[PDB]
């Protein structure tokens, strides 16, 4: 629950879908779904910010309301990192059900492995 | 769709008691509406097809136009009540020669009619709920001199309320049936 | 296949008197009765209007009547009236009184034998009779009353012939008579029941067309009464002259009327324009069309634009191509594709006549069925409800005998045809 | 600043103040009285560029129905066929205010009128016509004491329902014009009541289909029906449906009618079928 | 000035006021603006 | 200050099309600044509300909307644009 | 490849007037409408100002607009006056009063919707529209305010087209009204913005041109329109006719307009010559290339010898050969080349079309752009200056409702203008 600037009221729901709300009578004007459940809400002086429960932190433009990711983090103890065998521009860590590979130079990342409702412990290279 | 099943005695596809009773059945309705109503005369649940256009609203079986039924029981049975205005259905078959024909029964045909695709025929419907034991081996062999193997395509015309589509191997009395296929006022 | 004409009432026999001077001109019929026409394509079909006398003379077959007789004396002293056979002048000795009921049930009762009787010898000398056609005003005494029971005579003795009306309607501005919403409420009543197609004309319109197309600066009733002649005149073209697509007043009513309550018609004529306009602009098929759906040309008050059209139709006269006409007939379909009913594929029927109206090279007439005449009855009701509810002028009519409860059945039956229209105008597919 | 709650649909309702203005008083009556040309800097400069990218935006204004540059996406107003119309007074109100009636209301779970009198004994050409008049009301306890009241004396009638006839046609033609489903579903239970209480009353009301039918062929497609396509109606028992109840009232006036009622509801409504021929 | 057919004649109408050079004006526009070649109803004229 | 009026787009022929009139599907990515000798050019108008916001996402629209595209061009009232192109040929997003 | 004109109050009008009498008279259109012309040379291209109408008539593509219509009556009470078609006259009720602000926003306005409505009723009629063509003068009230509008609205409408304008200036040395700074500077500001090509008189250039050349011992404001009409026909000359060397009006822009900004231009036309001299000189090429530059010929006050010319452009009508034309074209850049800007290697573009106008054996019309243009808008800009400190009859603009930060952008942009023009004068390559 977090105040705009106008007057109107910003909503979060677990669903992951985010709402706005006339302060007159509690109607929908606009709407965005985003992945994961919302806890927390920021101002911006040209947008807002939306944090998630799986740690991503999405970027929305209040003209009509669009949204962008710029955050991957986990959110559960991290159990194992490791390197390639002759690489070192990237590595792989595991956490919870997720693998993931980031880039070491610009702490970017892509790639994603998921096995919902389930936990890794290991991981290595070939 | 049924050419791996196991056929013998009876095999429904319709009927009106179920969660989804239309699951293999597409509806193409304009002009119309189809609903599941509580009928007053017998006390349970039916069907319904009603529309202004007696061509433009019915419903099929199967869903996809490409897929056939593969049903080799010779009789049909439906469970039809008659609203006092025009009805219609069709039935498609397969011979032994291979042709695939159509059995086409309305009650506002003027004349019987035999052409090398279609049967057009009339018909009448008796006053309240009627059971409809439709013999497709003897009208092939009576129409098209060749023997019968198969349906392949069931349709049904507005108006009428529809409790059960089912197909036999052979005519049974009252008493032979099961208690779920009589029908009780 | 030839029609009788029935004139009533004095702007009855004012506008008869202008139609036959329209079309003995069009036949070259002299006023003397003597043929002086310079082809054949005149003489083969004048049967369709007059009846053949011994020497050169023609005669009209025509019945007018009316209930004081100034008016039949000033139409036999007008410039074609010596053409009219004495025995069809019908009249009483006392006035309608300007009273409906007066009308239909006192001098009605009184004359109409003798009107009946006339008809009747007219009709059966026929060979073949087509319908009959009946000019007169709603809102007048006789016209109306007379009018309306000779009708349901008619209609009770030819009920499988054609029956069509012209009519005039009060205007929304200003009236001509006082007790006139109780007369135009029964005088519709009797129409719905009886007729076959019923055109109304507003002499607002005429006047609004004779001052904004022909600019004319000082109108008279003679040139409202040539702008009917010509509309009248145009309807019947194609049963009297050869033509590329026959049409007919049959065929005009079968394609028209999709109900049969639902007869009512907006008119209109399209060459009219000025003597300074017109050498700045030649006749041609497109500039017609423009001009025959602007509504600144149309004969009724309502305006096309709060309603939805039905059916239209238009009939041609002139040697002309068939290409253009489908072509601009298809093109102001697809433009203005939301005021024409969706249920209906193609609105408009198109005729083709090959012989126009003398001194015009073409000419197209236009009969529309809109639901935009739904707020004439409205008005009409609105204004009766107002002079009922306080028994404004009643005394007049309980005292010829008429029973009240006959007012509230014409103002429910005008108000149901007002629900139907309002209806079938938000009609939609589903 | 101040909120403005949405207060539609609710308990609280503007909508049905503005039809029925009669209503919403208390038991009694009333109380006594006292209780420029701002500048706005260059918005265009394209002079010296043209291009044949560029094309026009503003593209006059409006549109004409039959000019020659056409109607545009200009569309006709809708009439309202099915706007709901203002409730004229009733005289049930009138006579139950006044105190003149023969009834009372004996409270329970299922509801009932108590009688003052014995039935058989009134006069109905006095009575009848006036408790069908308070169909068209939408208030307590109006609502309830007319049309309960009306079946009431329709079932134990007799012989005598059958010379009030003429006298009825009016509150039911003007019931039936209020456009409200509501009082449309009330007047057309209380119609197929009426049709089978007694004998000979069928052939009595074929010459009136021009003022009754007329309503009927405009509400005879509308649905409550919003389920999608097998889904059962658990609201079956309150009868609701305008479509179902409209249809099966034409079927029972063609049966009891007589000789030629088909031919009259033929006319009157178009896409009738005959149910006996 | 016109036929009962519509055509625009030939010679000078009497005490007519339009002058020559108009009346073959209207003459070649209306001859211009023809659907046919000819009038397919000459046969009907009497004089 | 200014306002967008309209947008300006260059499209190819459909695939099919392309490849009867013989050609290449491949070979589209160059670092000259011509063009194809297949694109057109076609211009659409804003309406009077419309801002750099709803006319970038009209062009977004565009882009995802179908194959053969790769040019966009915006103008402004004052006469200037400003053109969006893919970093990546026959590529999206 | 037709073009619509425009004409606006007193001034446009007036020459409008003489404009139609020479293009009627070169394509031989009687004032009565009807062809009359003497080779089919001059049929084939007549659609280019003329629309066709249905008989044996033509109609001009133009617009009238006026705030009263006295001018109006005058014109159309004319000579030739006949032609136009009544609708095209679009007038109201009370004067601009020579003010721009009620010019353009009182009756401005009230008139725009339906002068746009005409305009496009004309340009939609059109198989291919070429650019518009307006006269008016800026100095006035009606002229200005609403010819700005029209033109700011045309631009909105038709961005694709070319915008071609013909404006009256004031003289530096005779005021012909009071308020002239204050109109001239807003209506700079808005064609600088909204115009493609600009041309601009001075009625001492034309008085001067009378006395000197023409030795006219009682000229009246026929002659001044008839060289201006005879320039303006002369530039469109090679669109509806055959040549060598074809040219159009926006390859003319695409020459002549380096910068967008820089569209002002001077124009003048050679083959003026007293009565009694044209016995001591035959035409010839030479001949009329002195002529052309000849700043006696030129109809603007500022003079070449102060400024340089970015770039020219010569039109040439007659049977001549392209040798002597591209000669004369170099010779003149060759020994004049301190007056051409240096950085364009080829200042002048030349065009031959095969038909000169009647009368005479050849004939050229001038456009040039030279930079000593902005000497006239600095003398405009220093008289409002000097009237805007004082707030020189400032109460009427101010009670119609103008912000002063209208006057103070305009009075800017103006300036930058000039500053523009001086330091691309003294540009150099470095
Ligand atoms: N168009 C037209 N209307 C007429 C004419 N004469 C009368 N009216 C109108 O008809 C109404 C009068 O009706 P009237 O014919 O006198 O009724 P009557 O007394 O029964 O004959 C008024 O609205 C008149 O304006 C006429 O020649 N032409
Ligand atoms: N060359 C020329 N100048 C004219 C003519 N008529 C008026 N003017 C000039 O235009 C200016 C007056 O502008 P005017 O047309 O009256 O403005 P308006 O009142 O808005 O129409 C003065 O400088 C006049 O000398 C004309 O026929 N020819």
Not at chain 1, 46 to 75: D, P
Not at chain 3, 40 to 61: H, M, S
Not at chain 3, 283 to 311: C, I, W
Not at chain 4, 48 to 57: A, C, N, P, W
């Amino acid at each position: 629950m977090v105040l705009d600037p106008s007057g109107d009221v910003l909503v979060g729901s677990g669903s992951g879908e985010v709402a706005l709300l006339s302060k007159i009578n509690l109607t929908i004007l606009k709407t965005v779904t985003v992945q994961g459940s919302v806890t927390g809400i920021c101002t911006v002086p040209h947008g807002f910010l939306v944090g998630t429960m799986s740690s991503n932190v999405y970027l929305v433009e209040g003209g009509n309301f669009r949204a962008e990711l710029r955050l991957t983090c986990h959110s559960d103890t991290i159990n194992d990192v490791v390197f390639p065998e002759g690489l070192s521009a990237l590595f792989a860590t595991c956490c919870g059900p997720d693998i993931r590979v980031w880039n070491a130079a610009s702490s970017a990342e892509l790639l994603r492995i998921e096995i919902a409702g389930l936990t890794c412990n290991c991981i290595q290279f070939s | 769709m049924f050419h791996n099943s196991y056929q013998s005695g009876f095999l429904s596809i319709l009927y009106s008691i179920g969660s989804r009773p239309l699951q293999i059945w597409d509806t193409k309705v304009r002009n119309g509406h189809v609903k599941r109503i509580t009928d007053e005369d017998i006390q349970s649940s039916v069907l319904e097809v009603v529309g202004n256009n007696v061509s433009t609203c019915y419903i099929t079986c199967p869903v996809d136009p490409k897929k056939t039924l593969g049903i080799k029981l010779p009789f049909l049975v439906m469970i039809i009540k008659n609203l006092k205005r025009y009805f219609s259905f069709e039935v498609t078959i397969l011979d032994d020669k291979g042709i695939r024909r159509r059995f086409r029964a309305s009650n506002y045909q003027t004349t019987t009619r035999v052409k090398p695709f279609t049967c057009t025929m009339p018909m009448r419907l008796d006053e309240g709920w009627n059971q409809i034991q439709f013999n497709l081996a003897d009208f092939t062999r009576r129409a098209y001199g060749t023997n019968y193997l198969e349906t392949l395509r069931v349709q049904l015309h507005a108006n009428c309320r529809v409790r059960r589509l089912y197909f036999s191997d052979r005519l049974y009395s009252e008493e032979e049936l099961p208690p779920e296929f009589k029908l009780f006022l | 296949r030839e029609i009788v004409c029935v004139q009533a009432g004095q702007c009855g026999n004012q506008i008869g008197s202008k139609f036959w001077e329209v079309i003995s001109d069009e036949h070259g019929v002299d006023p003397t009765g003597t043929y002086q026409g310079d082809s054949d394509l005149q003489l083969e079909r004048i049967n369709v209007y007059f009846d053949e006398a011994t020497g050169g003379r023609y005669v009209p077959r025509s019945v007018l009547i009316d209930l004081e007789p100034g008016t039949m004396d000033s139409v036999r002293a007008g410039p074609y009236g010596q053409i009219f056979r004495p025995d069809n002048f019908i009249f009483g000795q006392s006035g309608a009184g300007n009273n409906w009921a007066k009308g239909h049930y006192t001098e009605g009762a009184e004359l109409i034998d003798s009107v009946l009787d006339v008809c009747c010898k007219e009709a059966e000398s026929c060979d073949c009779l087509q319908g009959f056609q009946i000019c007169h005003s709603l809102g007048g005494g006789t016209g109306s009353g007379m009018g309306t029971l000779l009708i349901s005579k008619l209609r009770e003795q030819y009920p499988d012939r054609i029956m069509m009306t012209f009519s005039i309607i009060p205007s929304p501005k200003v009236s001509d008579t006082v007790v006139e919403p109780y007369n135009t409420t029964l005088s519709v009543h009797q129409l719905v029941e009886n007729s076959d197609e019923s055109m109304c004309i507003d002499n607002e319109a005429l006047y609004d067309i004779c001052f904004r197309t022909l600019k004319l600066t000082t109108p008279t009733f003679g040139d409202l009464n040539h702008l009917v002649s010509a509309v009248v005149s145009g309807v019947t073209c194609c049963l009297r002259f050869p033509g590329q697509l026959n049409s007919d007043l049959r065929k005009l009513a079968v394609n028209l009327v999709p109900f049969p309550r639902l007869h009512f018609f907006m008119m209109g004529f399209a060459p009219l324009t000025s003597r300074g306009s017109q050498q700045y602009r030649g006749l041609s098929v497109p500039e017609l069309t423009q001009q025959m759906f602007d509504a600144k040309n149309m004969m009724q008050a309502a305006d096309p634009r709060h309603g939805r059209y039905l059916t239209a139709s238009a009939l041609f006269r002139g040697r002309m191509s068939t290409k253009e006409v489908d072509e601009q007939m298809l093109n102001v379909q697809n433009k203005n594709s939301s005021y024409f009913i969706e249920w209906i594929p193609n609105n408009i029927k198109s005729s083709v006549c090959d012989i126009p109206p003398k001194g015009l090279k073409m000419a197209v007439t236009f009969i529309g069925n809109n639901t935009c005449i739904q707020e004439m009855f409205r008005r009409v009701g609105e204004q009766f409800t107002l002079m009922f509810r306080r028994k404004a002028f009643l005394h007049w009519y309980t005292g010829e005998g008429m029973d009240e409860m006959e007012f509230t059945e014409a103002e429910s039956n005008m108000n149901d045809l007002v629900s139907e229209y309002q209806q079938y105008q938000d009609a939609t597919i589903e | 600043y101040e909120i403005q709650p949405i207060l539609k649909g609710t308990k609280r309702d503007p909508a049905t103040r503005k039809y029925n203005r009669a209503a919403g008083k208390g038991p009694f009556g009333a109380f006594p009285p006292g209780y420029r040309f701002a500048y706005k800097g260059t918005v265009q400069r394209t002079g010296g560029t043209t291009t044949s990218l560029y094309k026009g935006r503003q593209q006059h204004e409006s549109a004409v129905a039959f000019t020659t540059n056409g109607a545009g996406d200009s569309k006709p107003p809708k009439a309202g066929a099915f706007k709901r119309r203002l409730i004229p007074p009733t005289e049930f109100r009138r006579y139950y205010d006044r105190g003149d009636l023969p009834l009372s209301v004996a409270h329970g779970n299922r509801p009932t009128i108590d009688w003052k009198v014995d039935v058989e004994r009134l006069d109905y050409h006095h009575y009848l016509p006036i408790f069908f008049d308070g169909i068209r009301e939408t208030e307590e306890p109006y609502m309830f004491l007319a049309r309960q009241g009306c079946l009431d004396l329709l079932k134990r009638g007799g012989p005598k329902i059958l010379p009030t006839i003429p006298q009825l046609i009016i509150p039911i033609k003007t019931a039936l014009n209020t456009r409200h489903p509501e009082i449309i579903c009330a007047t057309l239970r209380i119609l197929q009541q009426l049709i089978v209480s007694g004998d000979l009353i069928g052939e009595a009301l074929v010459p009136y289909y021009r003022q009754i039918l007329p309503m009927f062929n405009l509400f005879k497609s509308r649905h409550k029906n919003r389920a999608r396509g097998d889904a059962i109606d658990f609201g079956q028992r309150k009868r609701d449906d305008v479509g179902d109840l409209v249809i099966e009232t034409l079927q029972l006036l063609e049966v009891h009618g007589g000789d030629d009622a088909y031919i009259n509801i033929k006319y009157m409504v178009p896409t009738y079928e005959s149910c006996i021929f | 000035l016109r036929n009962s057919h519509g055509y625009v004649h030939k010679q000078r109408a009497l005490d007519s006021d339009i002058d020559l050079q108009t009346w073959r004006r209207m003459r070649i526009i209306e001859k211009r603006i023809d659907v046919d070649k000819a009038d397919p109803h000459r046969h009907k004229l009497n004089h | 200050l200014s306002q967008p009026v309209s947008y300006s787009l260059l499209v190819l022929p459909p695939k099919k099309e392309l490849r009867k009139k013989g050609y290449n599907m491949t070979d589209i990515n160059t670092t000259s600044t011509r063009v194809h000798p297949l694109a057109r050019w076609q211009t659409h108008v804003l309406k009077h509300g419309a801002t750099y916001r709803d006319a970038l996402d009209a062009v977004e629209e565009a882009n995802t909307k179908h194959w053969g595209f790769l040019k966009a061009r915006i103008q402004f009232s004052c006469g200037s644009f400003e053109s969006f192109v893919r970093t990546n040929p026959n590529d999206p997003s």
